[PDB]
């Protein structure tokens, strides 16, 4: 289900997020807060933001956008080896922060729709489906670190 090919698609398209993973990480959590105010919820200090251009000048929100593309980087870029990456994530997403895999599947959809909407000529179909399926391997392999923790969303 991932080829070499499909993996060289998804870095392809990272390496154009990585000319600027604060303003890509901004959107994406912009987009994520839009679609689905719900996740506003599980940030105390983002929740009360009250204007698309206060979330746009938040630093906080801006370094957040930045520590979330840092890490699912460092997992893309393993091509599913990425135990050592995840297993720490699952963790404080399950036990701590108590992360269901649908927001996790809502901010996949945030992060497809930023890129789209910033590279659509390095982000056709091909692209994109590489890519879901990078994102559905990372939620499945979250997902059954979730189960081991006892956490069960
Ligand atoms: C691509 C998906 C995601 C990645 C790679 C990611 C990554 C991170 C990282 C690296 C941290 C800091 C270290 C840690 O606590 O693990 C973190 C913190 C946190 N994450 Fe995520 N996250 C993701 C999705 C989400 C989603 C969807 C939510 C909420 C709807 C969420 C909620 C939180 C919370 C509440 C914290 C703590 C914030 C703080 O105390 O500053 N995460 N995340």
Redesign the pocket.
Request: aromatic share 12%; charged share 20%.
């Given at each position: 289900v991932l080829s070499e090919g499909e993996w060289q698609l998804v870095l392809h398209v990272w390496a154009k997020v990585e000319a600027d993973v604060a303003g890509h990480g901004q959107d994406i959590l912009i987009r994520?807060f839009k679609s689905?105010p719900?996740?506003?919820?599980?940030?105390?200090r983002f929740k009360h933001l009250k204007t698309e251009a206060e979330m746009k000048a938040s630093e906080?929100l801006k370094k957040?956008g930045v520590?979330?593309?840092?890490?699912?980087g460092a997992?893309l870029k393993k091509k599913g080896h990425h135990e050592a990456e995840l297993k720490?994530?699952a963790?404080?997403?399950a036990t701590?922060?108590k992360?269901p895999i649908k927001?996790?599947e809502?901010?996949?959809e945030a992060?497809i729709h930023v890129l789209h909407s910033r590279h659509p000529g390095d982000f056709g179909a091909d692209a994109q489906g590489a890519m879901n399926k990078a994102?559905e391997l990372?939620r499945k392999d979250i997902a059954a670190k979730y189960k081991e923790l006892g956490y069960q969303g």
């Open positions: 994520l689905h719900e996740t506003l919820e599980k940030f105390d906080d957040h520590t979330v593309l840092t890490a699912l997992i720490p994530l963790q404080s997403h701590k922060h992360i927001y996790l809502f901010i996949s992060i994102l990372f």
